[PDB]
TrEMBL record, chain C:
It comes from Epstein-Barr virus (strain GD1) (HHV-4). It comes from the Viruses. This is BALF4.
Amino acid sequence: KSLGTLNNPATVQIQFAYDSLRRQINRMLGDLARAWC
Amino acid sequence: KSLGTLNNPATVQIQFAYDSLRRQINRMLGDLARAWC
Amino acid sequence: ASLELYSRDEQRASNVFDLEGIFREYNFQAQNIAGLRKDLD
């Protein structure tokens, strides 16, 4: 038996771009919420 | 005749990442504009 | 999600000339002929 590797080396890099941009936006929202408080 | 399919299965997923992130940011801007009003 | 258009098997099966079929049968025929030509006991 074997694991079915797919020849798509782009899925991992697309996930990083979404994950990286998500982390920074959520931090900006937290900083803005504190100032409004 | 036939349609010229390109072996690039990554273009569709890149478009979703941009489209998904665009929808949420535009909704946050609308919520912030109401509060400022 | 992970998707792909053409798998490895699809690209392998898109060839008209089957090298494995051609050579395996050719060697089998020659080996059988060499048996009758020589002492096949």
